[PDB]
Amino acid sequence: QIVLNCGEEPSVVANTVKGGDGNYGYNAATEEYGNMIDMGILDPTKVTRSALQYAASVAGLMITTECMVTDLP
Amino acid sequence: ASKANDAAGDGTTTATVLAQAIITEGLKAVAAGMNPMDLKRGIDKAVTAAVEELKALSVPCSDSKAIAQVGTISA
Amino acid sequence: AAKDVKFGNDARVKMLRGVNVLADAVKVTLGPKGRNVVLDKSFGAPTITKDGVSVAREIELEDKFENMGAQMVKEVASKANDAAGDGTTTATVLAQAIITEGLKAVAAGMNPMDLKRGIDKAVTAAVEELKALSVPCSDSKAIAQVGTISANSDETVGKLIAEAMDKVGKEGVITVEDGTGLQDELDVVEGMQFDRGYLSPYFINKPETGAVELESPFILLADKKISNIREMLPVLEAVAKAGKPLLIIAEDVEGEALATLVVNTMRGIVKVAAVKAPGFGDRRKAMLQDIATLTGGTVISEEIGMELEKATLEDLGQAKRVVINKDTTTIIDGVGEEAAIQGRVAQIRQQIEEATSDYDREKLQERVAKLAGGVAVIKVGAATEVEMKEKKARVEDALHATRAAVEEGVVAGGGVALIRVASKLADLRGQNEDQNVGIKVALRAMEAPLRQIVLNCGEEPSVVANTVKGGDGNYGYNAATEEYGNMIDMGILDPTKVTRSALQYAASVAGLMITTECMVTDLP
Amino acid sequence: AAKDVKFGNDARVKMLRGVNVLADAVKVTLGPKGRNVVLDKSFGAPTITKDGVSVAREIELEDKFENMGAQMVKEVASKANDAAGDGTTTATVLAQAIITEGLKAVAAGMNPMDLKRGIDKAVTAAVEELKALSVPCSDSKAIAQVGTISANSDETVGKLIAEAMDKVGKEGVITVEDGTGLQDELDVVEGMQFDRGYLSPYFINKPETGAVELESPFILLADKKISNIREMLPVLEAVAKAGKPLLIIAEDVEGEALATLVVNTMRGIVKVAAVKAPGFGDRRKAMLQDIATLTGGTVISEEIGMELEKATLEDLGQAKRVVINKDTTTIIDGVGEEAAIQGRVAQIRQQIEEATSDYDREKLQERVAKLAGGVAVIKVGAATEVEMKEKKARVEDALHATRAAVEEGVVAGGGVALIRVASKLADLRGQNEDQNVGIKVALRAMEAPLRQIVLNCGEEPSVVANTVKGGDGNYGYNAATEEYGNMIDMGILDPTKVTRSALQYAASVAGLMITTECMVTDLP
Ligand SMILES: [Mg+2]
């Protein structure tokens, strides 16, 4: 999504990042590849962890819905 | 998105994206004729393993520069 | 002529709706206990039938696009019948099952191209499983055995089929004629069959058959392409006064002469049919002559200087009967003198002596077979004319099954063979998850003909299918007797060739629809 | 009549919708794995084809204005095929891409005049890039190499193409005839080809071909314009009695005689065709005479005092075969005596001696080439008539590609060449920002045929495109085998001329639509 918002091929950048090891990644702001930590782009562990867990908890239940009931238009 | 905000106050946009990805692929799997309840368990088990991995990758942020970098990236 | 265009789901959904209507109406009559359908004649009393083919032929849909879906299935189903003699209804049933589940998969976001690929892989595996399942048919007992079964348990019909094949061989030429009296007759007479179709569909005087039957017709042999009606005139007029049908063999007939004959034949003064000569180039030269000797006719060659205008009846060959189908032409009981015919054979046998090439040896040998092998025919006798013609239809139905059975052997006919193969490759998997879905759709689709049979009978489709799955080989359920056992031994089977053709055609059309992204039609 | 008028966006939006319908239906069949389209013929069974040209011909839209957009694209696409032999579907694909993005740009508020200019600049740069990219095809090995590839990997087809060119020459005249036997025949016979189309489209007896084929017809040579049917009557009646087709060469034919011949030929007693004489003024005098000597016929000149009424069969030349297309006329195997024909050549060779002008020397030399060079022909042999006719179509398709290959060389045919050129001028810039946008639209549009191929195949268009971009030269992705490599070596290529023509025509129509501010049509 970050890459998509940058007007660049999301899959292309992902394949190159996947290819790399450790902290290697793409910097959207500078449009180039390098070590994410050296650059200064940091994600607190708590937000990263929480985002993944909250998204998954609701999503797992949501995909299992067979039938929904609601008021008429 | 709201729960993520409550937990840390940041990354809410990112959390929503993950929900989008999971839901779209999950529904597609349900369409395929797979049991939804099992798919949920697979997702949850993968999540539990992913969380542990994040903890191992996580390194302490103690210096002023590191703190400044997280604030700067957030803003 | 404004066009209405639909793409993606809008296009595919209409095809689905169209195919389902055709399929739903035709599937009810599939079983031995199958439900009957009533077709309404425009002016009079309605006709009721359990025959899927008649039902399918009749079906046309008001809604353009939906109509196309039904028609697309009908074309492919017709082809299966053309190459197997049976299974037209079965192919349609299989087509619906594959299409309905496959379409749901494409509209579900799964890749269509992969689904086709998965389905084809399952089909390919299924065909070989059928080959292992298949019980060979070679001996006279097997020929008669399949023939009597096809003949709806009539032992005598099977007997003539086996006897016919015994007299001229498996690949020989066998034809069926109306019986003069009560007794059934088997005769061998000089005659020839070759693979050449009819130039005009309009020529057919037997619409149920789709073939043209002529009584003791004059035969015109020509060495040149015919595009002008003028050459025909002196010979054409001569046949007209005589009052007998005329058959033409030449390089080809162009629209200038062909079109006039077509209009002339359809409710006109002189009704005639024409076909292309067998072989080509140097080979046609010898073969046309073989036909000439057989019918006692005279060949007309431009090379000689002989022309069609300069011709008479004495230059025309004769045979008691001739029949022309969509792609095959055969003649019965040529008038040519036995001395001439046998002598002609001697000339060909002498020709075989150079033996320059296996192909040339073979090709000459083939000529000997057609001219000397002869044509065996069957006359069908019965107490009443209705029974006689009805019995004749049954004989012909059995003959197609016997030839199909000879070529590939036989399999259980209760839909059981599809069941048996589907269970065998349940494990089979593909590279893509979408491909895996395609495999299940194809295998699941295979089950449907059995279930349809049971559904028609008023029995539980799921219950019977489960028990059939449990057993092995040809074991299965006979809907007519409500009994479980070896379907072949019991008396229910289909030729291996027909089962295969039905399944393959159904998969071909299904995959085809799955990959179709655009439809074009006129406005309503 | 009452007219419906739309301005600006209202006009352009309808053209966009119209073009998209035509484009969407035709683009699906572009790939080797291309998806098929089902067309309703009118009566009887449906027709299913992967042929974009067949689908394009059929499309007409209910909504006026939208219909015009489709038709505007169809005309230009047809022209590309006419001047290249292929790329009709490709041109349409490119046209949609340029038009859709270009129209969004004008709607957005950017200057339309500038967008056209930017697009044209990118197109012009791209054409040169194709010229550099293109691999030469001059030797027999290259001729045969391209011919077999086009012939769907059939080595024998390529061999005959090379051999034909080897005898008559690259610029010589090569024709294809149905084969009498299994063996393929290559023969050289006296004959002449010249550029002159048929006066009436109604004359065409081969609708798939778009050309008129005549068998051993009489040839009428005249020295005057013909407007009255009376002159024709004594010769006309004579040919009808003869039973052979009649071909007419003269200054021109007026509707009084032309219209009657057209009506007479369509479902009439005598079917004939006529074309205009080659050359003009003084030159035509010699040109008609050369044809006369070749055909063995007699020229009729008003100046002499000779008239058509006073002309007999003995005054008409003959050839075994003659064909006619939209703008070209050629004759095969003229009956004229070798002594007469060769002697005539000597007279012409003698004429060359004055050498008054390079133009006159050359013009006389050209006459020598046509009269003495002759026409080479190909007969196509096959096991069965369907295969023979099918194979013949393939041979003809290969020939067009081989001539185009010879004239401008070859490039990758997977849509790869457009990809390669688009990447090469990524940094090309225009004076105006709007012009820059036009440049991107054109370059981006180029990518689409590749993506369309991949989309049809069920593979990701974006993933395949990016990898293709990475490589250099003729490197690319083969959709049929799902493998990456040198497309030319692999076996996938298009003539340089066809790719160029498709791209240029697409740009021409696209720019044209962009600058159109008003549309006029009849009420519904
Ligand atoms: Mg933030």
Side-chain angles (χ1 to χ4, degrees):
Chain A
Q1 282 290 320
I2 296 170
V3 170
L4 180 60
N5 290 157
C6 294
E8 290 180 89
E9 338 279 31
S11 65
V12 170
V13 170
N15 290 337
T16 60
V17 170
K18 290 178 70 176
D21 300 310
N23 290 161
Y24 180 90
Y26 180 90
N27 185 340
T30 60
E31 290 180 271
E32 60 180 50
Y33 297 90
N35 188 270
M36 294 300 290
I37 300 300
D38 290 340
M39 290 180 180
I41 300 170
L42 300 180
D43 290 349
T45 300
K46 181 180 180 176
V47 300
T48 300
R49 182 252 300 168
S50 291
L52 180 281
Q53 290 180 328
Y54 290 132
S57 181
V58 300
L61 290 170
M62 190 180 290
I63 61 170
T64 61
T65 300
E66 181 60 10
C67 180
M68 290 180 297
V69 180
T70 190
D71 290 337
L72 290 171
Chain B
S2 180
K3 227 300 180 176
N5 180 230
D6 290 340
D10 199 350
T12 66
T13 300
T14 300
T16 300
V17 170
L18 290 170
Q20 179 70 290
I22 295 170
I23 293 170
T24 300
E25 290 300 300
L27 290 173
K28 181 180 300 176
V30 170
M34 290 180 180
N35 185 39
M37 187 70 210
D38 290 339
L39 290 170
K40 180 180 180 296
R41 290 180 180 96
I43 292 170
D44 290 340
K45 182 180 180 174
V47 170
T48 300
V51 170
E52 290 300 300
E53 290 291 340
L54 290 170
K55 290 180 180 265
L57 280 70
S58 180
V59 293
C61 180
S62 56
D63 60 299
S64 291
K65 180 180 180 177
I67 291 170
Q69 290 180 160
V70 300
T72 300
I73 199 70
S74 180
Chain C
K3 300 290 188 64
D4 190 340
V5 180
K6 290 180 180 295
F7 1 140
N9 290 351
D10 290 340
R12 290 180 299 264
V13 170
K14 290 291 180 56
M15 290 180 291
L16 180 60
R17 290 180 181 165
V19 69
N20 290 154
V21 170
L22 180 275
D24 290 340
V26 77
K27 70 180 184 176
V28 300
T29 63
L30 180 60
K33 291 180 180 176
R35 300 290 171 80
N36 60 341
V37 180
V38 180
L39 290 310
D40 180 50
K41 290 180 180 176
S42 61
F43 0 78
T47 300
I48 300 170
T49 190
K50 292 180 180 64
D51 182 85
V53 170
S54 291
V55 170
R57 180 180 291 114
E58 197 70 0
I59 300 300
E60 180 180 350
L61 300 180
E62 180 180 351
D63 187 288
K64 292 180 180 264
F65 300 122
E66 290 180 350
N67 180 44
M68 290 180 180
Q71 290 299 150
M72 290 180 69
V73 170
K74 290 171 60 176
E75 180 180 350
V76 70
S78 180
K79 290 180 180 176
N81 180 270
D82 290 339
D86 202 290
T88 300
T89 300
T90 300
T92 300
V93 170
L94 290 170
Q96 180 180 210
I98 300 170
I99 291 170
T100 300
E101 290 300 301
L103 270 52
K104 290 180 180 176
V106 300
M110 290 180 290
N111 190 272
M113 197 94 210
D114 290 339
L115 290 170
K116 180 180 180 56
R117 185 180 294 178
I119 291 170
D120 290 340
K121 180 180 180 176
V123 170
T124 300
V127 170
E128 280 70 0
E129 290 290 340
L130 248 65
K131 290 180 180 296
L133 180 60
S134 180
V135 180
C137 180
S138 175
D139 60 340
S140 291
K141 180 180 180 296
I143 300 308
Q145 180 70 40
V146 63
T148 64
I149 291 170
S150 187
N152 191 199
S153 306
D154 190 340
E155 290 180 350
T156 69
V157 170
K159 180 180 180 179
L160 285 70
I161 296 170
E163 290 180 276
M165 290 180 70
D166 180 286
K167 290 284 190 169
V168 73
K170 290 180 180 176
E171 290 70 31
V173 180
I174 300 170
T175 60
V176 180
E177 297 180 350
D178 290 329
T180 60
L182 180 61
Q183 290 290 100
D184 290 340
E185 290 180 275
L186 190 155
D187 290 337
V188 289
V189 70
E190 299 300 300
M192 190 180 290
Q193 180 180 290
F194 60 90
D195 290 340
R196 220 70 180 191
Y198 53 72
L199 289 70
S200 180
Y202 290 90
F203 290 159
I204 300 170
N205 68 333
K206 301 299 175 184
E208 290 291 84
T209 300
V212 180
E213 290 180 82
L214 300 180
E215 295 290 340
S216 50
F218 290 90
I219 300 170
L220 187 278
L221 300 180
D223 194 39
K224 70 180 180 176
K225 290 90 179 176
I226 300 309
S227 60
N228 190 334
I229 320 130
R230 180 180 297 100
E231 290 90 89
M232 297 359 287
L233 300 181
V235 300
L236 180 61
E237 180 180 350
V239 300
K241 290 180 290 176
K244 300 182 190 175
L246 180 279
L247 187 278
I248 300 170
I249 300 170
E251 290 290 340
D252 200 320
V253 180
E254 290 70 30
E256 180 180 350
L258 180 150
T260 64
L261 290 170
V262 170
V263 170
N264 181 340
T265 62
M266 60 190 290
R267 290 180 294 169
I269 296 170
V270 180
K271 190 180 305 296
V272 300
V275 300
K276 290 180 281 64
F280 53 90
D282 290 340
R283 250 90 76 264
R284 76 180 190 273
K285 290 276 60 176
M287 290 184 70
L288 180 61
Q289 180 66 276
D290 290 340
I291 299 170
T293 300
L294 180 60
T295 60
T298 300
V299 290
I300 300 170
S301 300
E302 296 300 300
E303 290 172 0
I304 298 170
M306 290 180 70
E307 180 180 350
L308 290 170
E309 290 180 350
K310 290 100 190 176
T312 316
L313 290 80
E314 63 180 91
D315 299 310
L316 280 70
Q318 290 180 160
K320 290 180 180 176
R321 290 180 51 80
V322 57
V323 300
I324 300 170
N325 70 300
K326 180 180 180 296
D327 60 340
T328 304
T329 300
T330 180
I331 60 170
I332 300 170
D333 192 340
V335 190
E337 294 295 86
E338 290 300 300
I341 292 170
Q342 299 299 320
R344 180 63 180 96
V345 170
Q347 290 180 85
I348 299 170
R349 290 281 178 80
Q350 180 180 40
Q351 290 180 40
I352 300 170
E353 77 180 350
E354 290 71 29
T356 300
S357 180
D358 290 340
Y359 180 90
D360 290 302
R361 181 182 290 91
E362 180 180 350
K363 190 70 170 280
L364 290 170
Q365 188 60 60
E366 290 180 350
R367 290 180 60 208
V368 170
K370 293 290 186 63
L371 180 61
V375 180
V377 300
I378 300 170
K379 290 180 180 63
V380 180
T384 180
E385 180 180 70
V386 170
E387 180 180 350
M388 189 270 120
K389 290 180 291 194
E390 190 298 300
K391 181 180 180 176
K392 180 180 180 176
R394 290 173 60 202
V395 170
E396 290 180 310
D397 290 340
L399 180 149
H400 290 286
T402 300
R403 290 180 180 271
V406 170
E407 290 180 350
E408 290 180 7
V410 300
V411 300
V416 170
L418 290 296
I419 300 300
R420 181 90 311 128
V421 300
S423 70
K424 291 290 185 60
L425 24 151
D427 290 340
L428 180 65
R429 300 290 177 184
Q431 290 87 272
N432 190 210
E433 180 180 39
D434 290 340
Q435 290 180 210
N436 290 332
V437 170
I439 294 170
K440 290 107 170 176
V441 170
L443 290 170
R444 180 170 60 195
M446 290 180 180
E447 290 180 2
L450 180 61
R451 290 180 180 264
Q452 184 60 50
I453 300 300
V454 170
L455 180 61
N456 290 335
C457 290
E459 300 300 320
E460 280 255 30
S462 67
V463 170
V464 170
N466 180 60
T467 60
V468 170
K469 292 290 183 56
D472 300 310
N474 299 310
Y475 180 90
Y477 179 90
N478 183 340
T481 60
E482 290 180 280
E483 290 180 350
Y484 290 90
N486 185 270
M487 293 300 290
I488 291 170
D489 290 340
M490 290 180 70
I492 300 301
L493 50 170
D494 295 325
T496 300
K497 181 180 180 183
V498 300
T499 300
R500 180 180 62 80
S501 291
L503 180 276
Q504 290 171 338
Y505 280 113
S508 180
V509 70
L512 180 69
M513 290 180 180
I514 291 170
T515 60
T516 300
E517 290 290 340
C518 184
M519 294 180 70
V520 180
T521 192
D522 290 340
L523 280 247
Chain D
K3 300 290 185 296
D4 190 340
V5 180
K6 290 180 180 296
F7 290 90
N9 290 339
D10 290 314
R12 290 180 300 264
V13 170
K14 290 300 186 64
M15 290 180 290
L16 180 60
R17 290 180 180 161
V19 68
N20 290 142
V21 170
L22 180 275
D24 290 340
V26 78
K27 70 190 190 176
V28 300
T29 63
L30 180 62
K33 291 180 180 176
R35 300 290 180 84
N36 40 210
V37 180
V38 180
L39 291 310
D40 180 34
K41 180 180 300 303
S42 260
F43 293 90
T47 300
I48 300 170
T49 190
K50 291 180 180 63
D51 190 349
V53 170
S54 292
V55 170
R57 181 181 290 112
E58 212 73 38
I59 300 300
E60 180 180 350
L61 300 180
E62 180 180 40
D63 190 340
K64 291 180 180 264
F65 300 121
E66 290 180 350
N67 180 46
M68 290 180 180
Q71 290 299 150
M72 290 180 69
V73 170
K74 290 173 60 176
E75 180 180 350
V76 70
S78 180
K79 290 180 180 176
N81 180 270
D82 290 340
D86 210 310
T88 300
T89 300
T90 300
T92 300
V93 170
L94 290 170
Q96 180 180 210
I98 299 170
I99 292 170
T100 300
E101 290 300 301
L103 270 51
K104 290 180 180 176
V106 300
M110 290 180 290
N111 189 274
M113 190 75 210
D114 290 339
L115 291 170
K116 180 180 180 57
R117 185 180 293 173
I119 290 170
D120 290 340
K121 180 180 180 175
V123 170
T124 300
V127 170
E128 280 53 30
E129 290 290 40
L130 266 66
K131 290 180 180 281
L133 180 60
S134 180
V135 180
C137 180
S138 180
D139 60 340
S140 291
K141 180 180 180 296
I143 300 309
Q145 180 70 70
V146 63
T148 67
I149 293 170
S150 186
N152 190 200
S153 306
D154 189 340
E155 290 180 350
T156 69
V157 170
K159 180 180 180 189
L160 284 70
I161 294 170
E163 290 180 280
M165 290 180 70
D166 180 282
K167 290 283 190 168
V168 70
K170 290 180 180 176
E171 281 70 287
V173 180
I174 300 170
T175 60
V176 180
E177 299 180 350
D178 290 314
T180 67
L182 180 60
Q183 290 290 99
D184 290 340
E185 290 180 277
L186 190 155
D187 299 310
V188 290
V189 70
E190 298 291 330
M192 190 180 290
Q193 180 180 290
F194 60 90
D195 290 340
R196 225 70 180 191
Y198 53 77
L199 290 70
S200 180
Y202 290 90
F203 290 156
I204 300 170
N205 68 339
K206 300 290 180 175
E208 290 291 85
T209 300
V212 180
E213 290 180 81
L214 300 180
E215 297 294 339
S216 40
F218 290 90
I219 300 170
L220 190 280
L221 300 180
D223 194 37
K224 70 189 190 176
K225 290 90 173 176
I226 300 303
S227 57
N228 190 337
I229 330 120
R230 180 180 294 101
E231 290 90 301
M232 313 322 310
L233 290 176
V235 300
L236 180 60
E237 180 180 351
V239 300
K241 290 180 70 176
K244 300 182 199 249
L246 180 278
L247 183 279
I248 300 170
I249 300 170
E251 290 290 341
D252 210 310
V253 180
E254 290 70 30
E256 180 180 350
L258 180 150
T260 60
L261 290 170
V262 170
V263 170
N264 180 340
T265 65
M266 60 190 290
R267 290 180 65 147
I269 298 170
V270 180
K271 190 180 300 296
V272 300
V275 300
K276 290 180 280 63
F280 60 91
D282 290 340
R283 246 88 77 264
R284 75 180 190 273
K285 290 277 65 176
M287 290 269 65
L288 180 63
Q289 180 61 328
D290 290 340
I291 297 170
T293 300
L294 180 60
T295 60
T298 300
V299 290
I300 300 170
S301 300
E302 293 300 300
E303 290 171 0
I304 292 170
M306 290 180 70
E307 180 180 350
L308 299 180
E309 290 180 310
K310 290 100 190 176
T312 316
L313 290 80
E314 63 180 50
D315 297 310
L316 280 70
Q318 290 180 160
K320 290 180 180 176
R321 290 180 51 80
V322 59
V323 300
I324 300 170
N325 65 300
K326 180 180 180 296
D327 60 340
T328 304
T329 300
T330 180
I331 60 170
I332 300 170
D333 192 340
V335 190
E337 291 300 320
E338 290 300 300
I341 291 170
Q342 300 299 320
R344 180 65 180 96
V345 170
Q347 290 180 40
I348 299 170
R349 290 281 179 80
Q350 180 180 42
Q351 290 180 40
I352 300 170
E353 75 189 310
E354 290 80 40
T356 300
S357 180
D358 290 310
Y359 180 90
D360 290 296
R361 190 181 300 98
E362 180 180 350
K363 190 70 170 280
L364 290 170
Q365 180 70 70
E366 290 180 279
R367 290 180 60 207
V368 170
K370 291 290 188 63
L371 180 60
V375 180
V377 300
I378 300 170
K379 290 180 180 61
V380 180
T384 180
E385 180 180 70
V386 278
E387 180 180 350
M388 190 270 120
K389 290 170 63 176
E390 190 299 300
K391 181 180 180 176
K392 180 180 180 176
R394 290 172 59 204
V395 170
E396 290 178 310
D397 290 340
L399 180 148
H400 290 285
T402 300
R403 290 180 180 270
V406 170
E407 290 180 350
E408 290 180 6
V410 300
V411 293
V416 170
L418 290 308
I419 300 300
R420 180 100 300 128
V421 300
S423 70
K424 291 291 186 61
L425 27 150
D427 290 340
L428 180 61
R429 300 290 177 184
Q431 290 90 260
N432 190 210
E433 180 180 35
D434 290 340
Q435 290 180 210
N436 290 331
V437 170
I439 293 170
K440 289 104 170 176
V441 170
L443 290 170
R444 180 170 59 193
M446 290 180 180
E447 290 180 354
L450 180 61
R451 290 180 180 264
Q452 184 60 50
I453 300 300
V454 170
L455 180 60
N456 290 335
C457 290
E459 298 300 317
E460 290 246 14
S462 67
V463 170
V464 170
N466 180 46
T467 60
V468 170
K469 297 290 180 56
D472 298 310
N474 299 310
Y475 180 90
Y477 177 90
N478 183 340
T481 60
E482 290 180 310
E483 290 180 350
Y484 290 90
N486 182 340
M487 294 300 290
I488 291 170
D489 290 340
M490 290 180 70
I492 300 301
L493 70 170
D494 293 329
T496 300
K497 181 180 180 180
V498 300
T499 300
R500 180 180 61 80
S501 293
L503 180 264
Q504 290 180 328
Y505 280 113
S508 180
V509 70
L512 180 60
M513 290 180 180
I514 291 170
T515 60
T516 300
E517 290 290 340
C518 180
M519 290 180 70
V520 180
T521 195
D522 290 340
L523 293 183

